[PDB]
């Protein structure tokens, strides 16, 4: 009994998502996960000598 325009609207490809999508897809907040090395750990101490000459 639904109007046909309303019925076909529900079948937009955007209205279908796999079951369990929101509970399974990884949503990363960074490319360097916790426990991985980055510039914060590799930065030299501020008293280091110039590394350009070498």
């Amino acid at each position: 009994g639904e109007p046909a325009i309303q019925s076909i609207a529900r079948f937009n490809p955007d209205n279908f998502r796999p079951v369990g999508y929101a509970e399974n897809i990884p949503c990363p907040d960074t490319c360097v996960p916790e426990g991985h090395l980055d510039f914060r750990h590799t930065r030299l101490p501020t008293w280091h000598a110039d590394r350009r000459p070498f």
């Binding site: 030299l44 280091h48 590394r51 000459p53 070498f54």
Partner: protein, 92 residues
Amino acid sequence: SGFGTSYAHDPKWIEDWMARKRVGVDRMDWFFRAFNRLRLYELFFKSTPRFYAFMVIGGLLGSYYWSRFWEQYWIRVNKGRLYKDVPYVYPP
């Protein structure tokens, strides 16, 4: 553990290894301070023409003495087996 399977994961010792980030530690700085006291950057490297002259002049003198060193190395390893080391005695 789990080596060789789909359950493979980093062992505890590999994980403890990666927990040592050595942040703030610099145990090789002494070498850079000492190298910087040679003033090679302020004298040669900084200026492009002088950097080129270091590579050329340093390659001329480096090549010669490198050859000199390894010639002496060879003369020593093969002592007594070289033509110069064994003058020939003419048959009577």
